[PDB]
Amino acid sequence: DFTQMFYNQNVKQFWLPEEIALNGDLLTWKYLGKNEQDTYMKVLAGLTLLDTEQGNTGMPIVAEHVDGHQRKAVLNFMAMMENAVHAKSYSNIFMTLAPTETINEVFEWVKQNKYLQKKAQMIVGLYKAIQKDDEISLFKAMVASVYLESFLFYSGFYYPLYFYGQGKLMQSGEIINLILRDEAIHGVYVGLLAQEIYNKQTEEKKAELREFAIDLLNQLYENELEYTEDLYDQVGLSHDVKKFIRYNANKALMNLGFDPYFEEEDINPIVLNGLKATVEPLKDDDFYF
Amino acid sequence: DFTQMFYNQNVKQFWLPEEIALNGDLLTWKYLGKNEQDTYMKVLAGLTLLDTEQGNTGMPIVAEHVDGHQRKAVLNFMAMMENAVHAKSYSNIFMTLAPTETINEVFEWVKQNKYLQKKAQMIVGLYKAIQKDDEISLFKAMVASVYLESFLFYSGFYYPLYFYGQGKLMQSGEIINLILRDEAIHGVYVGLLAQEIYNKQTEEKKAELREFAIDLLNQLYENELEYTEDLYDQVGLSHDVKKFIRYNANKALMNLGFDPYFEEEDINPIVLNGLKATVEPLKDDDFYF
Amino acid sequence: VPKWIQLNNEIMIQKDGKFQFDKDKEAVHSYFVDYINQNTVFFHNLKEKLDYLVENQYYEEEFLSLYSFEDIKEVFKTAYAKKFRFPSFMSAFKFYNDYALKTNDKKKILERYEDRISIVALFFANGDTEKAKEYVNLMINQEYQPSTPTFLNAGRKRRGELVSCFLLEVNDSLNDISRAIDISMQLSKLGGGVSLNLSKLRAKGEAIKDVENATKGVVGVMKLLDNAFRYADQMGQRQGSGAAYLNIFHRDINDFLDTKKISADEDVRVKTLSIGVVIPDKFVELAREDKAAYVFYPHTIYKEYGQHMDEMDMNEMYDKFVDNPRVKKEKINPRKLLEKLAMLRSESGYPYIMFQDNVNKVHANNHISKVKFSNLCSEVLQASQVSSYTDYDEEDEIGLDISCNLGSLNILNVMEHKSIEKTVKLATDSLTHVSETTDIRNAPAVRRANKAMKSIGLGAMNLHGYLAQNGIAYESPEARDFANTFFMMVNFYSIQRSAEIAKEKGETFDQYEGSTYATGEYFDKYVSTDFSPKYEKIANLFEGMHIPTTEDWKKLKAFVAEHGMYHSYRLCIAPTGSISYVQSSTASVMPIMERIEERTYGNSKTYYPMPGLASNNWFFYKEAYDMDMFKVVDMIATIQQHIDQGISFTLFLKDTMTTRDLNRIDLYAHHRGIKTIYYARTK
Amino acid sequence: VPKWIQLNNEIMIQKDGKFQFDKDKEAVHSYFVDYINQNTVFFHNLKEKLDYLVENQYYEEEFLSLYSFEDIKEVFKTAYAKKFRFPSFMSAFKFYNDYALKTNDKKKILERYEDRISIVALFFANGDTEKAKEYVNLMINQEYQPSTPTFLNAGRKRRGELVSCFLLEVNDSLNDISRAIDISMQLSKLGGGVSLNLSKLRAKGEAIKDVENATKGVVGVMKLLDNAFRYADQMGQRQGSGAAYLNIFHRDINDFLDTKKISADEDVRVKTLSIGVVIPDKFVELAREDKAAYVFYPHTIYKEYGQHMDEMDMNEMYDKFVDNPRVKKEKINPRKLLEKLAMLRSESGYPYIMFQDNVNKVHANNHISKVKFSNLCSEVLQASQVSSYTDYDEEDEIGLDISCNLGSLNILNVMEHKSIEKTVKLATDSLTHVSETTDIRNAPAVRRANKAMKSIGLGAMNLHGYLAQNGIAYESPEARDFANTFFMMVNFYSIQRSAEIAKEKGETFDQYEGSTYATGEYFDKYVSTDFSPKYEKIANLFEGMHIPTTEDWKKLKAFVAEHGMYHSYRLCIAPTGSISYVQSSTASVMPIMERIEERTYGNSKTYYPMPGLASNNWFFYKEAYDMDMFKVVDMIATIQQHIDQGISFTLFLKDTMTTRDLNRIDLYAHHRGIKTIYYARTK
Ligand SMILES: Nc1ncnc2c1ncn2[C@@H]1O[C@H](COP(=O)(O)OP(=O)(O)OP(=O)(O)O)[C@@H](O)[C@H]1O
Ligand SMILES: Nc1ncnc2c1ncn2[C@@H]1O[C@H](COP(=O)(O)OP(=O)(O)OP(=O)(O)O)[C@@H](O)[C@H]1O
Ligand SMILES: Cc1cn([C@H]2C[C@H](O)[C@@H](COP(=O)(O)OP(=O)(O)OP(=O)(O)O)O2)c(=O)[nH]c1=O
Ligand SMILES: [Mg+2]
Ligand SMILES: [Mg+2]
Ligand SMILES: [Mn+2]
Ligand SMILES: [Mn+2]
Ligand SMILES: [Mn+2]
Ligand SMILES: [Mn+2]
């Protein structure tokens, strides 16, 4: 009942980072403190890693196991967006704002950062555990994918949105909003596929799947807290970002058909403001009038 | 040396089925004989069936085994074009020209057809034989992929190009020309990835891979001749189609860095109508002798 | 943004659901209060102005020396006594940006509208102060408009030629091809559009000195001509414009047409060379009966018969060519060729279509030659004789190359002044003067044909404007009735003026005695059919003006028999591109493309409503694309029955209609007697 | 595969580690006993053959009518008495594929080598049986070889022109540009390579009658000429080849060069027109001193001084041009321009380099005009006067457009027969006859220059073949000594024959009195310096032949002063591309590119060893690319000191060397007196 409308929405949302000129951010970037620039680079690098794996691994593997040519076409399109559009856009931003050495250093930093490695290990592990014709392993990977789309990106998205909302780094911010618009529909779509599998189960099996989903969310959440503190303490925003990730965790649960898990909190209003011609042959009657 | 350049060329060639209005083809379709309509339907179904294998298996399997983030992104983009753009385009052409019952029957016929099946299963067999961390099996699959993209499609493309060059079925011919333009670049790109593997091999292993490629080409070519007579004898075109197959076989070989196998031949003109030395500054005292 | 541009863009801003058309008038005032008067050079008296313009090599001394200064001052005073005001901003903008004389530094305005009109009138009169005042009253009433070359360059020392339509015949030789390239370059240097007939050139794969498969065909000649026209581009001011015409029975016709396909390679496609196709009635008959046609090798026909393929009547020669074994030919499908023509016109508007028999069944000078091709605008249709340009130190055989003299009547201004006769006769006199004062020293056949034929083209414009401001739909039968009557009167007074000039000067055009004017055949339909309006509304439109009857036409026929006719050709309806803006008129006899046109000049936007457009006549100003092309063809044929040459007839198509509709329009034009089809503009 | 093809391919199959050169001989036998003798057309006697060739429009009957049939029979018997045998398969193959006369359908061979030589000799003699026999003995001994046009076309009805190269001066006007295009097409139709000097044309951004920034520069004329040469391509047999020459001080020199850049856009790139650059000594001096140079606008210089920029000496007028405010100029870096020249020559072999001062410091006819450009092969260096092609109906001022007839001495055969004098005199007579019977009716300046200058080009071939077959390294000082002596002898006997022809005809070339031949200056270095061989081996090589001394040169100088010279120019060393195969000779005076060349014909491949290549002279046949280009420059300068025109000097470069090495070679060539540099061929 939904794939065709998602197909149409995904293809109509198609974009490339080159559509957005980035040289306009040069001055507002220059004006940020060293702490702010550091957090910003690292935040986008963490996002780049997530999209790299979502494009290389997550979306293609889910596409492989989901039945139906139209469902596969949507998932293939989403996969392309992840690595050919989203992951690449971050390099466009980096290449504009930062010198090569700072770019090299931040990519080295992703490799050695323990929270980023842990979250990649956990998410990609679940993708690679999918067994052919085994719907339960597929469900588990789809939960992981929804958590990546609708929860994990948001510790990263906070900062570009926070600046956009203050009228700073607005070209980079425009790119990020386009990425976010895509991930929102990706999270909903994968959520609907996960619910399909969940709804086939016995009540006992469903109870176990909810346990899996909640245990996984809590494990990812605890890691994300440490990641958030590590990045945002130097810019004074860790508590604010934490509220934002809890907000989005609830959206991820809802995408999976589950009740919200965290209590509602006031999000920084700045971040809320951040959101040939046709040919016919000649008939013999066309020669007479 | 080449992936970013191909990335650029691929994304700038992006298109959607909806861009070409198909209904005006009915003004020339109605004037074709039964044999012409039959051949067109059968050719179209042949292309559709082969392209589906490439979208569901060929491109995604190569993307899975190739190392490199940028290569995986380009390959993902190509897989997207197969599944999201090409497949919808073929379906659109069919739905415009034939009623539902006729489409189902043509696909039943072509699905049972000996020559279409032989080539489809030969290609799919090589994709299924790729082994993790074995570059030889990957190379063999890449050869199969290049043969599909740059050679096997062309016994089929001939007919729409033949009409397109005559002013008939111009809307669907425009679509086919866009598809063909994508398959050409797909073949060239996968060809470069195959040459990379080939160049890492010993001289004995190279000779062995050359023998594999030529042997495979021979098997496919002999089946193409039979496929060609089966479809095109009823419309009197087989001689010229055979010249077009050999010409495209030579392009496929050149994509794989190999010499042409067949002598140069001229192609049907209707189908054609459808289709540094080191700079060193003068140091003075070079003017005196 | 300047104030006048804001006042002009305020037109689109709708007040009470209506366009602010009157605001345009205010814009004109601003354009004169803020810009034109500030940048207009003023002198203490006209004597100082004339001395400054003559001394600084702006004007010519010869034409001003024919008058005393008192007469020139009187002519200027007559021009300024009208107190002419441009009714729309675009009229004044186009005049002062394209036609008004500017200093060498292009920052000051030396000529006003009255100054330019007075200078052109003094040039026209050639020493007659009363005639100059008559011309000034004609042009300041905007009844007659000299063409862009004549209007812009008359009386100016730094100028091109006053003729910009040139038709060249190219003979089948390397010497003739090189001479054609040279003449095309020289005429493009003069600022003229050059049309070349390539039908006499032998096709690709023909023999040169009895060696086989040697000729490159007409496509190589087209490449040479395209390079020549790119090189000669009015000293780097405008893009060099040229046209090539090929008969549809020439074998190269496909390759010819292939020069305009987008898929054509760089060695095949010509970009600055327009193409036109001449379609004899035989091709239309073959396509109609679906019989397969033959495209012939011209050199084999020339060897067999001693005459070029385009020099004989294909209707009686086609069967003999086909049955002749010594004539080489290739099988083609005429319906496929027609579909290819329609497809090419849909893609790019090319080629121009010339219906040879439609032109030649009413051609008055078939004895001199049959009309084999048209001009760059596909409205000049005259007899031409090819020239034999031999080797060096050998006398050339100079033929006739067409070069007619353009000038357009403003139908609205002419008819509201009830001065069809006076305007037509004065325009004929001015065109005769400009033809007599034209001397081209690098085009021998053009000069010879200008001296001999004395052919002029008197066109008309503001037909749709006049009809819309009078509550008449362009497609209505009343509009065709008005066009019939008006252009019959135009033809009558043009013939009368030509005969009067022949009687006064005692000379006719060369080979007039063989023309249908001399034999009286031309007047047949005029001495038997009454062209008075059949509708009361059109008759009331013509009130106050004598409409020539059959007796008047008989008297004119007798007068022509006794005295002859000075001009071989008199009337041709040119597109009238930019002069229609200055005259505040719709272009040519074509229907308007848009009611309000949006243009971009510099980095500013401007809005030109069609002249006289308002809420009351908004519906009558129907756009050309919304119109039925069959009724446009009917109107153009109604006009063409009174025009000796052709009419620049652009087809206006919607993107929805296919090549079958285009072919149907072309075939209905052929059936209705349309001589030429200019363009296929798709909306 | 044919038997002779297998025998020729058997050369590379080594036996006992050595090439099977003798197999080549076997191939020729096969090629004659299986193909040539079977494909030849035999008649009962010579009378039937001559009649069949005359009535079937193969031969011109006029030149054969000057002899009785007994004399023609005697000439043919003299040709066949030598029993000439082709020593290599490729010699016979090249003759019978490119020069032997075939039937209309090209299925049979009508002309043998002896038949072709007899016909050419009978054409040369012009009715003299003894002279015809002398020419037969000269050509059958292969001492002298007429150029490809003369050898291929002499005495043929379907022939083209016997002149190989034509040089045109293009004046700065549209009429002159169009005439140059026409003449280029006419001469390419005749089969000759056309070179055009574009240095008089004003640069881009110049004024055409007071409207500035109007000219397209030399690039637009280049595009026009490129299209003209593409169109006129010898009836589609041989691609039309043209050359454009521009002075390095022309403002367009960069854009000129940009026509040959591999990254050039289609609107600038020119692909069928070779480019040459004329470099005065002033440019080399500026580059040497690293002082920024100035390129000039020709039209400003012409306006200020009344003469063209290339019409006067830049070495004395460059400072006046720079200090003149009325002359427009642009700043350039001469060293950067030299590096651009080197890069362009590395990439594509263009431009040709003409050292103007090197040409004009020894030019004998500077009074008539300085040499401002060269031909398509960059070996013709003659005075030319530009023509003033005016408007139609106006008389044109016809200048002098260079044209000379080519003919090459086979150095090995000439020295083996010890007949330098006789061969040189007979070749001079044959070239004089070719000039006299040449009459071009569409190139007036070429015709006038042929009639007045009477210039001929007597080249030489098989220099490297003779040196390698005599155990002399081409780079050795002994080889340069041999070249000095041999070409001094050639110059001496050419001057003697020219003076004898002037005496026997009582006429010299036009304006001979102002030449250095008349004043005796030309003979200065010949009456003070002895050019006898300095090495005993070379003197032994010249044994049996009287080497002219200073006394003989003084006598020749007195003889010239008394009688004058018939030819303005006598010696020019052409590349001699394909006719060197027939003569079994190395191409021109250039060193061999390769010892054995593999050429693909049809679907077969053939190997041509260099003439006389064997085990004992393998290393004497050193490949040109392996040679020091400085010593090749030394050889070419040594030859050039005795050649009045230029030598087609191709540079043979390795891929490893840089553009700096190419610039060093060019500067050493300029230092050593090299007049022109032909090509930069990279291995
Ligand atoms: N619409 C217009 N078309 C042409 N010229 C105009 C126009 N409007 C103003 N001008 C020029 O500006 C001048 C000023 O005209 P304005 O409307 O102010 O009053 P006026 O009574 O015509 O003035 P004047 O004393 O100049 O005759 C005119 O004489 C004329 O030269
Ligand atoms: N290398 C060659 N060059 C030119 N002509 C050749 C050559 N080889 C053979 N021929 C021609 O083919 C003929 C074959 O004869 P061949 O040379 O074998 O010797 P032959 O029969 O003894 O007579 P002869 O040598 O006296 O002509 C020759 O007479 C000659 O006309
Ligand atoms: C007509 C024309 C000339 N030219 C250039 C090429 C010629 O070398 C140069 C001279 O043209 P000319 O034929 O000499 O023009 P002209 O005599 O009318 O102008 P002037 O009195 O100044 O000589 O102008 C163009 O580049 N494009 C053109 O269209
Ligand atoms: Mg001829
Ligand atoms: Mg001039
Ligand atoms: Mn993403
Ligand atoms: Mn996503
Ligand atoms: Mn596909
Ligand atoms: Mn593909």
Give me A12's structure tokens. 């109509």
| Cβ-proximal residues to C361 (8 Å cutoff; 6+ apart), any chain | none
Q: Would residue B159 count as lying in a domain?
A: yes
Give me D285's structure tokens. 């001096």
Number of Cβ within a 10 Å radius of residue D294: 18
Number of Cβ within a 10 Å radius of residue D102: 16
Is-contact D169 D401, C-beta < 8 A?
yes
Is D377 one of the catalytic residues? yes
Q: Would residue B281 count as lying in a domain?
A: no
Q: How far apart are CA D276 and CA D256, in angstroms?
A: 9
- Find the catalytic residue in D114, D137, D358, D377: D377
Residue D668 CA to chain centroid, in angstroms?
A: 22
Nearest to C639 by CA among C475, C482, C411, C525: C482
Handedness of CA A17, A23, A28, A30 (dihedral sign): positive
Nearest to D286 by CA among D318, D334, D251, D252: D334
Q: How far apart are CA C612 and CA C279, in angstroms?
A: 39
Q: How many residues does chain D have?
A: 683
Nearest protein Cα to ligand 2, atom 26: D83
CB contact under 8 A, C682 and A287: no
Q: Which amino acid is at C513?
A: E
Q: How far apart are CA D647 and CA B208, in angstroms?
A: 54
* CA dist D55 → B232, D52, D59, D667 (Å): 54, 6, 8, 57
Residue A29, domain extent: 1-275
| H-only helix segments in A132-237 | 135-147, 154-164, 170-198, 203-232
Q: How far apart are CA C97 and CA C120, in angstroms?
A: 18
Contact of C614 with chain B, judged by CB distance below 8 Å, is answered with no
Contact of B19 with chain A, judged by CB distance below 8 Å, is answered with no
Give me C291's structure tokens. 């019989």
Is-contact D482 D467, C-beta < 8 A?
yes
Q: How far apart are CA D19 and CA D28, in angstroms?
A: 17
CB contact under 8 A, A79 and B80: yes
Residue in this structure with the two tokens 């996968």, named with its chain if needed: B190
Residue in this structure with the two tokens 């003894």, named with its chain if needed: D130
Residue in this structure with the two tokens 């780094």, named with its chain if needed: A169
Rg of chain A over Cα atoms, rounded to whole angstroms, equals 22
Q: Would residue A215 count as lying in a domain?
A: yes
Q: How far apart are CA C392 and CA C474, in angstroms?
A: 56
Q: How far apart are CA A172 and CA A40, in angstroms?
A: 11
Instruction: Name the packing angle between helices D477-505 and D629-640 (round to 10°).
Output: 20
Is-contact D325 D250, C-beta < 8 A?
no
Give me A103's structure tokens. 């770019």
DSSP E strands, D540-644: 596-601, 604-609
- Find the catalytic residue in A7, A31, A90, A164: A90
Q: Would residue A285 count as lying in a domain?
A: no
3-state secondary structure chain B: CCHHHHHHHHHHCCCCHHHCCCHHHHHHHCCCCHHHHHHHHHHHHHHHHHHHHHHHHHHHHHHHHCCCHHHHHHHHHHHHHHHHHHHHHHHHHHHHHCCHHHHHHHHHHHHHCHHHHHHHHHHHHHHHCCCCCCHHHHHHHHHHHHHHHHHHCHHHHHHHHHHHCCCCCHHHHHHHHHHHHHHHHHHHHHHHHHHHHHCCCCHHHHHHHHHHHHHHHHHHHHHHHHHHHHHHHHHCCHHHHHHHHHHHHHHHHHHCCCCCCCCCCCCCHHHHHHCCCCCCCCCCCCCCC
Q: How far apart are CA C467 and CA C478, in angstroms?
A: 9
3-state secondary structure A243-263: HHHHHHHHHHHHHCCCCCCCC
Window 313-342 of D: residues touching B by CB (8 A cutoff) are: 335, 338-339, 342
Give me D122's structure tokens. 């009978």
Run of H or E including D456: strand D456-461
Q: How far apart are CA D99 and CA D565, in angstroms?
A: 33
Reduce the DSSP state of residue C357 to 3 states and report it: helix
Q: How far apart are CA B180 and CA B81, in angstroms?
A: 12
Count of structural domains within chain B = 1
Cα angle for residues D76, D80, D84 (degrees, 5° grid): 140
Most distant CA pair in chain A: distance in Å? 86
Instruction: Specify the experimental method.
Output: cryo-EM
Instruction: Name the packing angle between helices A135-147 and A114-128 (round to 10°).
Output: 150
Is-contact C368 C330, C-beta < 8 A?
no
Window 251-290 of D: residues touching B by CB (8 A cutoff) are: 284, 287-288, 290
Is-contact D12 D607, C-beta < 8 A?
yes
Q: How far apart are CA D303 and CA D300, in angstroms?
A: 5
Residue in this structure with the two tokens 């195969």, named with its chain if needed: D581
Reduce the DSSP state of residue D270 to 3 states and report it: coil
Nearest to C166 by CA among C366, C460, C377: C377
Residue in this structure with the two tokens 């060893």, named with its chain if needed: D609
Q: How far apart are CA C428 and CA C405, in angstroms?
A: 10
Written out in words, the top-level CATH class of the domain with range D143-280+334-683 is alpha beta
Q: How far apart are CA C403 and CA C194, in angstroms?
A: 9
Q: Which amino acid is at C501?
A: I
Nearest atom, ligand 3, residue D210 CA: 22
Q: Would residue A1 count as lying in a domain?
A: yes
Contact of D1 with chain C, judged by CB distance below 8 Å, is answered with no
Contact of A69 with chain B, judged by CB distance below 8 Å, is answered with yes
Q: Would residue B109 count as lying in a domain?
A: yes
Q: How far apart are CA C49 and CA D391, in angstroms?
A: 35
Run of H or E including C461: strand C457-461
Measured between CB atoms, which of B277, B282, B286 is closest to D346?
B277
Number of Cβ within a 10 Å radius of residue D483: 27
Q: How far apart are CA C125 and CA D551, in angstroms?
A: 83
Q: Which backbone phi and psi does C18 adopt, to 5 degrees?
A: -135, 145
For residue A288, which residues of chain C lie inside 8 Å, CB to CB?
Answer: 288
Reduce the DSSP state of residue D385 to 3 states and report it: strand
Give me A173's structure tokens. 């911010």
Is-contact D197 D356, C-beta < 8 A?
no
Is-contact B276 D658, C-beta < 8 A?
no
In this structure, what DSSP letter does residue C209 have? S
DSSP E strands, C321-416: 329-332, 352-355, 406-410
Is-contact A96 A116, C-beta < 8 A?
no
Window 271-290 of D: residues touching C by CB (8 A cutoff) are: none
Q: How far apart are CA C559 and CA D209, in angstroms?
A: 48
Contact of A285 with chain C, judged by CB distance below 8 Å, is answered with no
Residue in this structure with the two tokens 């503009």, named with its chain if needed: C681
| H-only helix segments in D247-327 | 253-258, 281-289, 298-305, 314-323
Q: What are D607's strand-pairing partners?
A: D598
Q: DSSP for D639-681?
A: HHTT-SS-B---EEE-SSS-HHHHHHHHHHHHHTT--EE--EE
Q: Would residue A289 count as lying in a domain?
A: no
Q: How far apart are CA C661 and CA C283, in angstroms?
A: 19
* CA dist C599 → C203, C581, C604 (Å): 43, 13, 8
Specify the CATH number for the domain of residue B118.
1.10.620.20
The finding on whether C95 has its CB within 6 A of some atom of ligand 1 is: no
Number of Cβ within a 10 Å radius of residue A134: 12
Q: What are D575's strand-pairing partners?
A: none
Q: How far apart are CA B14 and CA A16, in angstroms?
A: 11
Q: How far apart are CA D196 and CA D194, in angstroms?
A: 7
**Phi-psi category of residue D520: left, alpha or beta, with phi > 0 → left and psi -120 to 50 → alpha:** left
Q: DSSP for A92-147?
A: HHHHHHS-HHHHHHHHHHHHH-HHHHHHHHHHHHHHHT--TT-HHHHHHHHHHHHH
How many CA atoms within 13 Å lie on the side-chain side of D642? 28
Which of C260, C664, C682 to substitute to test the interface with A, most A CBs within 10 Å? C664
Nearest to B187 by CA among B100, B81, B94, B43: B81
Is-contact A261 A253, C-beta < 8 A?
yes
Run of H or E including D169: strand D165-169
Q: How far apart are CA C279 and CA D151, in angstroms?
A: 50
**What are the start and end residues of each CATH 3.20.70.20 domain in chain D?**
143-280+334-683
Q: Which amino acid is at D258?
A: D
* CA dist A127 → A60, A63, A148, C333 (Å): 10, 11, 12, 63
Run of H or E including C168: strand C165-169
Q: Which backbone phi and psi does B197 adopt, to 5 degrees?
A: -65, -50
Instruction: Return the ligand number nearest the Cα of B157.
Output: 8
> Please, what is the end-to-end C-alpha distance for chain D in angstroms?
30
For residue A279, which residues of chain C lie inside 8 Å, CB to CB?
Answer: 339, 343, 658-660
Q: How far apart are CA C397 and CA C179, in angstroms?
A: 13
